[PDB]
Amino acid sequence: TVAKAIFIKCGNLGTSMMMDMLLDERADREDVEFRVVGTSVKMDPECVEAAVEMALDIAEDFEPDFIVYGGPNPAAPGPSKAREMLADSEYPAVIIGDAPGLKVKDEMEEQGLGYILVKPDAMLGARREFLDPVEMAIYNADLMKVLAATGVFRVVQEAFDELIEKAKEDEISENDLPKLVIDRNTLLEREEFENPYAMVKAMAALEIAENVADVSVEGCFVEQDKERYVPIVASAHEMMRKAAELADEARELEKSNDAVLRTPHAPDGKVLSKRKFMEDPE
Amino acid sequence: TVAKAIFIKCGNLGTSMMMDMLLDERADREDVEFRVVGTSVKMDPECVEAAVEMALDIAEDFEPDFIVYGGPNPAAPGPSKAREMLADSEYPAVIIGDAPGLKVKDEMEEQGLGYILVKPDAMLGARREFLDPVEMAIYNADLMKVLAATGVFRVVQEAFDELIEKAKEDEISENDLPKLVIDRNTLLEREEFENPYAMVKAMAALEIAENVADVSVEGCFVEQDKERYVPIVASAHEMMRKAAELADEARELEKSNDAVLRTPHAPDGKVLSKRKFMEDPE
Amino acid sequence: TVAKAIFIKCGNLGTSMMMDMLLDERADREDVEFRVVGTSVKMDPECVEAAVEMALDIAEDFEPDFIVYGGPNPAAPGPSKAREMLADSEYPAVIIGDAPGLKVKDEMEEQGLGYILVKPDAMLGARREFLDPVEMAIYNADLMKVLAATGVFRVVQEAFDELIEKAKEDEISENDLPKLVIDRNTLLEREEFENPYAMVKAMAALEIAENVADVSVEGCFVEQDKERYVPIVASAHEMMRKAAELADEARELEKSNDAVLRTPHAPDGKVLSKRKFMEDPE
Amino acid sequence: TVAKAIFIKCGNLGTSMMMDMLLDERADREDVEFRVVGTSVKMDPECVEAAVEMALDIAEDFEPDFIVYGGPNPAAPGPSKAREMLADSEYPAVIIGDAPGLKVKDEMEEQGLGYILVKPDAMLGARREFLDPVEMAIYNADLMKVLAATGVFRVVQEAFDELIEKAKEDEISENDLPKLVIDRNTLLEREEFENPYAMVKAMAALEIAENVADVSVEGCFVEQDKERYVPIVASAHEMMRKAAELADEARELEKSNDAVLRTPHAPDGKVLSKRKFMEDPE
Amino acid sequence: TVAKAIFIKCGNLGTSMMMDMLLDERADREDVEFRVVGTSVKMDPECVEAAVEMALDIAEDFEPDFIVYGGPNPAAPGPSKAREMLADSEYPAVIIGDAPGLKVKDEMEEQGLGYILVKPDAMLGARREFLDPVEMAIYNADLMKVLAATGVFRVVQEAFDELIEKAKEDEISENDLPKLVIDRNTLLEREEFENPYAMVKAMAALEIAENVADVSVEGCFVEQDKERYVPIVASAHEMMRKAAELADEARELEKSNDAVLRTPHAPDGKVLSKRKFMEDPE
Amino acid sequence: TVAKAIFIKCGNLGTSMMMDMLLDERADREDVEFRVVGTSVKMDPECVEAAVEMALDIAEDFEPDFIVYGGPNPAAPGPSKAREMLADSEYPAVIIGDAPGLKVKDEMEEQGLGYILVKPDAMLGARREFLDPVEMAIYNADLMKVLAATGVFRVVQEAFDELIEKAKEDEISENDLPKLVIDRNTLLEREEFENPYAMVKAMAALEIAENVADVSVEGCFVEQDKERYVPIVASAHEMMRKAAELADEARELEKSNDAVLRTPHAPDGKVLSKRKFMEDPE
Ligand SMILES: [Mg+2]
Ligand SMILES: [Mg+2]
Ligand SMILES: [Mg+2]
Ligand SMILES: [Mg+2]
């Protein structure tokens, strides 16, 4: 049959920005249908409510098997509000956030919602003297490349593909809701990379990515001297740029061996697989 | 004065992906309020329709000073549908798209619509054999790095920022709507780069992102032999990855001359500017 | 048997610069003898004729099995004159040219001439303000790498050596003359690369090289505003530099797989073959 | 007035391959007229003689102010033969060779001819097991990039341009004939590079290119064990590839400072000069 | 007056490997005289005791003005014995260590010892399965590149140069001994880089280097699973390799601005200074 | 049985800096015990003698099985005094040096001393106007990287490990002492690289490094003009930097084939071996 879900996006995150598209890359999955609503970058308690009310507003006629909320710091005012509104609705919800979301990690099991906490999806150096729109874009391009090439996006894809199957089974229980925490070590469980050094390079990429957070936090919430915080947050961007280079390096190693894992979606939604370039998705 | 807008996102394009965030990079603007709605990757006449209705729906109470529709190919069934829906509504609308929209450029002005066509925002190789979620994301990472580091996003931002000023003047006419077609030569009319070699590299990056389109189509809708179109779409990706490298290069040149242009928004919406890293934006 | 030929070089084309040397790379080939005549970069109607005359003059005593004319744009005043002069001669001939020669592909087949059209051998951005002597050399370096590392030169070689064999059968008929149009898609129907990704990188590299031509054309003829054509002709050169680096990346990929295809000429003229580095060519 | 000269090319050398073209880059120099003749790669005493015989043969009606012979090792059988025939003609000649030509350096002062010996124009790894047509082209592309970007070609261009002036004065005396030896230290008497590190990098690139010859020679003429000579010549080619990278790196520094030295020819033949990209050749 | 000191090296740290050499880079200083002793890489109490006793026996007749002990973890048993032994002597002493030394910072002050703790001097992935002699050297090469190119070594050089001047006046009090903790933020207050982006890339390099320590600790002392720790320590090395490239990029930015800081020693000990390449130090 | 040795370090050489460490990479060997003494960068006769006397004085109660002296030029005055002193003692001794040691090769054999001369271990551009501490450290970082990644250090490790086993049997004869001369060709007959291009790239790195010596020598002892020798020595440092990148390139190829050789020491001193990342050493 056909499964449906709603995506609410407040504020920006590398994972939230891509989460719904990781489910139907070519737009040929006839077995799903999604809606996307949000308040852009804004994520204060007010805008959040309005967004979740905009999702509950259309879920009435849309009737989503599950709703997903994606944004930074799920333990902050704005996002906290939205955890409430979704925990108390006739819809199974999933909250996708970053590392600060480990604070309210217990509280999320309580509210009965699923979650995808990406640690390497670090906050960017948000300081007016440094972060303008373009810098903002450049940083996201480097983070997108590290989360994709290291195989973290695969984890999110497969997590929302294993749910979309239980959604067609007309049985979405809280035991079916994912409870994930993505980090460098997560790659130690997969078989993503055939070349071991590629895994080690992807691991290093994610380690660096996770570290970008502390640098951005310090420069934005701790250092108050212009002469010190501008360079600090900028150094957080230089780090992520390198993590992106490491990610690319990992991918190229897999190209040298012709083992680049590829798992596309069949028109009916079933996840295929392949390693060799001219292999034809199995 | 507080301007309002509604972004309709159907299908995916690099420009539509970040278009709204380019207007409030740090979420500190208190002169704007946005509501984003879309049907994700799917952009057929059915989904597109439901999305615009969804946007017009909330537009009654939101009261946007304008509505923006972004997605690939404005000449396609769905986009054309949305193009007539917005033209017939009492809302000043803008259409953001790729090269394929040119076929309906003279047609959009008659509908009284504003448009911004980004030629280098090329369609990716959407073959099930090559394009899986990861690959799609990686593709957009490079495409984003391109549109950002080459100055194209600052063009989009500039156009909308000037529009948001008009939206405050309580007067948005067909003359105040943007009618731009971005391409490699668009940089010739700007002073984005201080280093002349940074610009020509930037131009090369956009010229190459532009050619990527021909290959993606030649392998998605033209060629039908399995043994040819897979290598064809993958070759379009390699082109995008190197285009992104030329963009990174150009920016590193602006970094060596400490002439990296940054144009961040003040809390009141005012667009500041600076070249030197240590200088505050004025 | 010892085949012979006379290459006429008028103008500058990457394929005409190497054409004869790809036939006797180590100069230890004793089954062939060549004579090279030309008037340097000048390819005007006068110089072109004075060149073909020298070739026809030398051919009297030399007595070649065929005569090759290499230079840019066979459909120009100079090349056209030479195209006709050779057709009227008693000597078989082949025309080495770029994309601009396709205009006269049908005509050359009528004149009974043979031809090899290399689409990716793009014209350089010749605009006094940019293309000085050094820059010209530089551009030709990148292009030489692209045509060499992608496999285009091996296609040229396999065609000219297949002809020299028929030239030993002292009977070269128009049916034995080459009629090739090299471009990105040529690699698709070959086995140059053992590594798949090295192939699509080579294909990506060839597409870019081809696309440089239009850029150089736009800036050398169409655009007449100095403030714009200087940047444009330079952007085309930054593009070919990228194409060269891409070709290099492809060769290194073959190296990681110890599969660099090498096909050297034995002292007798036979084309040997090898993959593995320490493997003898047979 | 108008100056003329003939160029004989036997065997290949990076400088011998570009020599003529470095004097008329766009082919719009009306004050010169060149002719090019040779036997391709072959350079044995027989082929050489037939080549210098074909140059003197056309020099009858062409009446050249000076003839130039270019090819590897001007102290070998073939080339030595050509020094004889040119020293014994009514035409002033210039011998273009590589480092092995310093052996017959004094003997050439005696024969009364000029010479340009480029030390960094190293011999390649000419072994059947390594050097095929493709590899041979890859090497010349690297060599071409270093000879150009390091500013060596500029030295050769200036030399033949200072001669083409004294050739319009119909006074080509042996004193006006060039007696040059070019190597790493040539850059110390130049102004080629404004950035001191770009010069330093170029010096290193030349030093390495020069040292490549010693490796090639060993692998080709000294090491007789196939298991050792193949890797040796192959390493000589890896060295040249990095030299090309260093040269390129020097050029990029110059772009960074907007000081890329350009010396294009004026339509009448006088060498112009400029630094800034948009400066307009003066 | 000649300044005398004894350096003791037990175990290995980047900073301790180069500490004494940074004080006499050309070996032409006439104001210093050094003795270096140690037990190589072994830093257990037994060996460290022999090392210090070796130094104290030498001090008898050599009469140094100060003694330096350098090696990892000032808090470990072996280094602790050295601190105890040095604290009990009459010779002013300094402890060079890494992050773990912070645990005994209070103890060192109470012991009258000086110290320089370099946090970016990270412990390597010391697991037999991954660290052999060559990998150990590779890591050191990268670490050295990071500490030198970021400017950390100039901080250490600086500290000791002042201590040496005071020694020449036989007046080294406990309050003269350095108490430095070096890390990413140390660079914020140095006039090391003229290019702001070079400082930011360098800060990024030091941040990543510091991060390496944590990753090496996890793989060597926490994770006990062979399958998990081998990849973890190898990823630690990948991070250091990338940190080295950042330091290298910063160094190349200074070169582009012909602003690389050099502070060589004059024959009489005076520390000169310069920026421009051809500028003489003073 | 535990082997004991003393290492004497005077002056600085890449190999003398790492020698002892390569023998106990993780400090977990039970079969060895070393003592290190030296006079830092100073290697004049007075200092060298003071150093050797320190060693021989320790030797009395330490009872070393063999003594190693490492540092620049075994033929210089200082090093020569060391050779005379050690050749005059009862302790078997090995001299670690650079190319200039070849001069006293016969003299060393007549003295009953062993030797390992590392030709690529080149002297740096030791000119005050260029070489300050930071640059000295950066040069050694690249040289170390070269000596490690190319396998030169593995050769050094092997020579000493063999000598160590002999020591454990109290049987070190003058015929057991090494007489090695390491250079580019040394790599031709080792098992180091599985990939041939990695071996080739490693050879290229050694050739360039070996060549760096001559450039530094020219700039330090021959050229006397500040305006010539500054750029000269600096170009020696740019060469080394590229030799390091080639060594890194060779290492990355091995990683692509998961054939990176690692020969770690077992606790009992046994030299293990492995190739595959996940493969345990045996
Ligand atoms: Mg005291
Ligand atoms: Mg006390
Ligand atoms: Mg003895
Ligand atoms: Mg004896």
Topology at a glance:
Six copies of one chain form a homohexamer.
Chain A: E1 3-10, H1 14-18, E2 32-40, H2 45-62, E3 66-70, H3 77-87, E4 93-97, H4 105-110, E5 114-118, H5 133-149, H6 152-161, H7 163-166, E6 179-182, H8 196-222, H9 226-257
Parallel strand pairs in A: 1-2, 1-3, 3-4, 4-5, 5-6
The structure holds magnesium ion (4 copies).
Residues 92, 112, 174 of chain F line the site of one magnesium ion.
Short description:
Chain A has 282 residues and is of the alpha/beta class.
Which features would summarize this protein structure in a list?
F420-dependent methylenetetrahydromethanopterin dehydrogenase; Rossmann fold; trimer of dimers; helix bundle; alpha/beta; hexameric; Helix Hairpins; oxidoreductase; binds magnesium ion; homohexamer; 2 domains
Describe the protein.
Six copies of one chain form a homohexamer. Chain A is α/β, with parallel strands linked by helices. Chain A has two domains: 1-123 and 151-182, F420-dependent methylenetetrahydromethanopterin dehydrogenase (MTD) (Rossmann fold), CATH 3.40.50.10830; 124-150 and 183-258, Helix Hairpins, CATH 6.10.140. In chain A, 46% of the residues lie in helices and 13% in strands. Chain A has nine helices and six strands, in the order E-H-E-H-E-H-E-H-E-H-H-H-E-H-H. Chain A has helices at residues 14-18, 45-62, 77-87, 105-110, 133-149, 152-161, 163-166, 196-222, 226-257; strands spanning 3-10, 32-40, 66-70, 93-97, 114-118, 179-182. The first copy, chain A, has a six-stranded parallel beta sheet with strand order 2-1-3-4-5-6, with helices on both faces. In chain A, helix 5 (133-149) packs antiparallel against helix 8. Chains in contact: A-B, A-C, A-E, A-F, B-C, B-D, B-E, C-D, C-F, D-E, D-F, E-F. The interface between E and F is large, with 75 and 74 residues. One magnesium ion binds next to loops of chain F. Chains A, B, C, D, E, F: One of its GO terms (molecular function) is methylenetetrahydromethanopterin dehydrogenase activity.
